[PDB]
Symmetry: D2
Subunit: 474 residues, 4 copies
């Protein structure tokens, strides 16, 4: 039961819009919207969406495995060894948000301050004192982008695993000699950095030049979650505000995916005429190039929706019905919809490109979709005795001012973390929060396993979070 | 009773080192160290210090007023009008951490997300709807450094007031015509930006080329807080670890100030031989150029302590007794003291240059000194009924889902804020936290009105803060 | 009779290596090497070559026309109008080295100082006073690379014509409204800059992603000059020094082209065994990325010559027989061949990327191949009475200190220029030298219509140019 | 007899404006204007001037020696050794335009292609084979500005000598150990680069913060050439066009110097009323910041000529009588004088900042003043037998195809060069032209020992240079 299995199970349920049913339903963690800062829904005049992993949630592990297979196949085509073909995607290894260290070839899980929580070299999990040799302060400077790459998108899950597979393969393959910064194959030296760059290039190639999109669209039921409540929620939003799409994908792919997402024998509710996907949006913008979108953006272009090609020239005209935009900037949205930033709720899955940047650059209100949360929540609840023991142990140890029973803290930490996978929870390792967790709290005003959870609150709902006080104020 | 009056009153008290006396004393807010993240003092092996506004706290408002007067005098010397000479520093106007908007000539108090809390044009406090014309989303993008300047140091207090004085003067002086982005004086146009740049240049000039240092050192009792407990605390630190100085000031100024700070007829405790200031430090580094110090830094140089001039060439030798360093980098400290970042507690007042950068770039532990806290705390406690009313009002309004009694929320917000000054508390406007507050919580592991408060805790003390949980974990 | 017709006629002649025959032959302008700075051939220890338009000279106008057709087809595929398909390449319009002005959509021929010699908007040649409106000083700042693009390669000939075709088409097509900086098609505005960028992108696409290479290699006799004297010259060079190839092309294309260039039933001379092309080179380097090659370059890689793919990793080994390199830098050549810059004669056609950069960055000796010279020389000689009249007229006008017979100077200038084509000589407009001419003189130590002309001088030859004197020295 | 002695001798002569006298006078090399490209004076509508070393020629070696002494004194004040005080400026050592190599501490004289003509380490002239160790290709990449500094202004003459003095001193002083890249003094390492930077900083300091200007203006007769023909030439220019001043100096210094330059008991000619210097200029611009002036420049400001301070704000008004400008750009000149670039003759001594940049960035006509030419010409003529022998030797050697009598070429080269000084002629070493010579020819349309030489040609004069032909055109 993957996170997408949870989501698709919830998706198959029809909406009971009886108000008592709704209030009961959202009380359950799985159908809940979680709140980091208060948000009066009544003040939202525009609801904006990302597509991939927001409206179109790709099924797991099938989609990751396809991405993996095609990336491997690309590496082999450019000359990586044939043994790569015997790799197979393993959903139990990667957790999202890990940092690849290109100097030493390690996957690192870090807290918000760059402190090392976990360090794996290939599939070898490096214990504390062993990590000191390479990380003397058990710390990385994560903004060193020449050295560190943060794998924080769901598209990065296959490469997260593939990096580890590669390091493991080269390390254990007798043709190569392991060195601190890469591998020696006679008169060739493959640095972890060049290896990392080849992988990044292959993932990009698969998405943009290869067969990933083709293979996705020829079996959308296998690869894409579908939910008849989507048009219900979007039609409700359109009654109280304006609705827009701003996606990095191109028009042709967007059209295939969105058409599938709305392909039911009905419109918003059962019994109603089907309406085309485009009719749910006051503004549709493709090729958005987020996060550049939230600064200067790119020139505004118009899509010829018949050919799927761009019309030649910059589009200088007004918002009209049936127009599809390409490129532009977040100011295009504000200007054409007559909105200020705080009137906008933008809904997406990219913690950096969607949520952090829209908040910091423009003051948009933010809703972060976290697909894995559908399953992380089940683990959090099922294993809460483990976390509470860890809390009591931390309390007890601190009150003590028999301390070598803090190896008990290491053991419980490991057991808890393993319930989530080899790289633990998205949100923490034991009692320590990840960078990702901290970013979620700081930049996502609201978050949930799916944006569909908004359906269970009225549009006048006031989402509340407690005020923060400084220690000297408390 | 300024914040420095509080500090000097506490400074005049001799240290009672009876352990029961210490435990009683630190319980009081004023003598307390506040904790944002847990810190085991036992793990600190090096204590590092900034000088200005950390070890040498300048007396208020006298020091600000001297800075103001000399900056004004400099502007007049380069050709600003004679009327500037009738300005006089007013400590009740500026609060630290405001943003000068160089496009429209406004001082802005903002939250952590760039939302406007207060907007003043000269001495005119612009109410909510009036601010929308210039700030349609009541929001600034604070990283727009071409437009916005964050006045976050205590050295910036005089210029904070002076900017407002200038805008007020030009606005009301009939020789000039007020325009949206500056002032017209016939065939001359003075933009707020050029005006701001002249002020910045004059403040710098006063500190580096003018008479500020000279006038400071000729009356140190008037300008500098002095506390006989300083050598006691530093000698205690030296018993359990190493002690260092890393200051942006030059050797000659540092020597004058530090000599004064240690000028008592005794050493660490009453009755003990006086020792020179330098003897309290295992490493002394001047001309540090923080925050560049925490990245590449500059070449390491040696001071000829006899002349106060730099020796010619890069210093390539070891740490030795009596050597004084100039320039270098944070790695110089780590290397010469045999320390890792988390073994270091760095103590300073610059939220950006000392605390944020040392934490983010190197993983140092941080202690932020906040001089104004000595007085903010007195206001917070004296006026806590006002804040609690504001809390109950916010609760009551939210539970309501007679709402026009949220003008009561505006009124109480204003009354509370005015107790601190015209620009309110350093840490909040009503129930909304400032950018500065948020930075303190995120980057200062510990903070206090003075670093001297460390004297009241044993060096094995475990400072504790509660673990943070995400909303879905709570 | 195109310039390539001249070259192929000369190519069909077998080499008479009788020394009297050689001395007679090189006296003819067509078989001559021209000298800008003295060069003792005896001091050259390495002869280096570019491939495209140096060893492999593409036949004209067939190759340009193929490039044109495929570029047009690409533009139409991305949505340019169908009328583009009725364009046909016209070799009489473009001259190499023109500057496209992206602001106003003009092709400009300029002197070395940026003074306008010719200005065409589409096919409208703009006379002197008319050009002043857009060019008030009849001058461009050619290093303004955001605005001006210098079309100085032979690959740029088709786009040179296509830019003019496009400007002419849009101007005369009633669907569009001509504006100063581009064209209006209702709510779309196509700037000359965006148009230029689409053309540049399409040319690149055709070369790298499209069918140009495929179509070239399937009819090499149609598209590529071939000369049995090539291996004779290269084998002679190998007797007195080392020989290398440094090309921006990839291995697979290089191999197809070079194999064709050496495909005769003999080796160096008639009657000798054929040898593979690779055997003529002490070092072969592909994917050179000139001109970046002459600074930092890129990492050195090794080609798997069996697959045509790169081996994985950086190549760290020595020069060995049969190895093919990829990437690297000019230092790779120097190091592996044991050469200093002045020991190297580098032979290429790219005035910037080959000749200027190798000279300026490394001090290499330079031989510029200028394919069009084979025909320009015929015009220069056939029409020399016109140029001499122009000289006498310039003399006579200056001595005069009836001046309106300087329209005679304009007329003769026009008649002379038209003998070369609509954009005149590569090297001048009337008595004014082009930028290209000036670059040739300043950076090409030697130049010729073909590098094959070296065959006619012994390898001890001292090429001589007169010393330059300043005016006060003369 | 220094170059300034020549200039002052010519300056003391009154102008005989009889037209036959003028034609006779300009025929002499010393009073001649030399021509690199033809220039019809009749088309010049604006004559523009630099001040320092153009209008105000500083006397040699007195001015250089003052600059030297004060720079030395500054270095000693910041802690260089006392032995520096025994240095004394020696005019026979430096030639202008040398390159300081900061890696190895050498002064280099180079040709236009970066080939080494002369290499001195301190006062040790390094012969050919010895230079190969550090310069394997006897070549530098002169645009490597991190490594190489081109000393091409007359203000750079003292530092040129001082660099050599320093290298010589440290090398021969037993307290220091000479290393490849600098000097070791125990635990201090002084790199040639840091040494060079200290010298550069001291020269700047002397000019801007020190006593150089003060000492200059208190003895203007000792330090500044003065010529009563200056106002005659400028008044003549004003009859046929407009006249402007664009200087990097500030108003106060400009006023002192210009007042002195016009301090005669007469105006343009003897017997005429004296007029203030400002009356000779249609536009006066100070603080020009050339060469940034010829791109974006800086904001346009107005000088309060009473105080010598800038008025506050950007000057937005028109050109008016008595206004003095500060900052701005070359476009300010064009706009306010109603001129295009080719209508402007700009007259200055800075080959880069005045002449190259005005020509390349704006297409201005250029007149380069070369103060040393007044004496170089005397050497060129007095020693022309030496140069002619060198020419005949070069001819004879080349015709030979007894070659070890090219040591005769080295000997004559050395003897010729020594007549000019230890670093030879500004314009050549033997038969090889310097970088400076090449820049003069390429960017100075006209040049001369003094701009006063324009007085000897009528304003309708057509200055002629021969057309350039390519080798294949000749
Ligand atoms: Mg997405
Ligand atoms: Mg400080
Ligand atoms: Mg080529
Ligand atoms: Mg000058």
């Amino acid at each position: 039961t993957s996170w997408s299995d949870r989501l698709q199970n919830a998706a198959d349920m029809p909406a009971n819009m009886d108000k008592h049913a709704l209030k009961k339903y959202r009380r359950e963690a799985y159908h809940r919207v979680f709140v980091n800062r208060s948000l009066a829904m009544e003040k939202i005049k525009c609801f904006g969406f990302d597509m991939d992993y927001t409206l179109a949630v790709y099924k797991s592990p099938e989609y990751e495995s396809l991405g993996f297979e095609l990336t491997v196949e690309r590496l082999v085509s450019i000359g990586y060894p044939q043994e790569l073909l015997s790799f197979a995607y393993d959903s139990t290894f990667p957790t999202r948000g890990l940092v690849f260290d290109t100097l030493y070839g390690n996957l690192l899980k870090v807290d918000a301050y760059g402190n090392l929580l976990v360090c794996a070299h290939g599939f070898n999990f490096i214990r504390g004192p062993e990590t000191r040799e390479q990380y003397p302060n058990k710390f990385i400077q994560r903004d060193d982008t020449e050295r560190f790459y943060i794998l924080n998108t769901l598209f990065n899950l296959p490469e997260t695993y593939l990096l580890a597979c590669l390091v493991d393969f080269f390390t254990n393959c007798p043709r190569y000699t392991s060195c601190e910064t890469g591998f020696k194959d006679g008169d060739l030296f493959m640095s972890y950095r060049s290896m990392f760059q080849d992988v990044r290039d292959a993932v990009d190639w698969v998405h943009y030049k290869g067969s990933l999109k083709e293979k996705t669209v020829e079996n959308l039921e296998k690869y894409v979650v579908k939910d008849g409540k989507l048009p219900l929620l979007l039609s409700g939003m359109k009654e109280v505000g304006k609705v827009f799409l701003a996606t990095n994908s191109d028009y042709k792919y967007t059209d295939k995916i969105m058409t599938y997402l709305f392909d039911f024998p009905h419109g918003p509710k059962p019994g109603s005429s089907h309406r085309p996907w485009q009719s749910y949006f006051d503004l549709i913008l493709v090729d958005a190039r987020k996060p550049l979108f939230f600064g200067e953006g790119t020139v505004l272009r118009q899509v010829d929706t018949k050919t799927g090609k761009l019309k030649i020239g910059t589009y200088t005209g007004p918002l009209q019905h049936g127009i599809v935009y390409s490129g532009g900037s977040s100011d295009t949205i504000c200007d054409l919809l007559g909105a200020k930033g705080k009137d906008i709720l933008y809904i997406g899955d990219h913690i950096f490109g969607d949520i952090l940047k829209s908040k910091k650059r423009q003051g948009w209100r933010t809703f972060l979709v976290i697909p894995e949360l559908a399953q992380e929540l089940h683990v959090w609840t099922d294993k809460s005795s483990l976390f509470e023991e860890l809390q009591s142990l931390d309390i007890f140890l601190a009150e003590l001012y028999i301390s070598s029973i803090q190896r008990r803290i290491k053991k419980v930490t490991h057991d808890m973390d393993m319930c989530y996978g080899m790289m633990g929870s998205l949100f923490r390792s034991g009692s320590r929060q990840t960078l990702f967790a901290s970013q979620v709290m700081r930049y996502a005003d609201l978050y949930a396993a799916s944006f569909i959870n908004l359906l269970y609150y009225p549009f006048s709902y006031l989402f509340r979070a407690a005020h923060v006080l400084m220690p000297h104020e408390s």
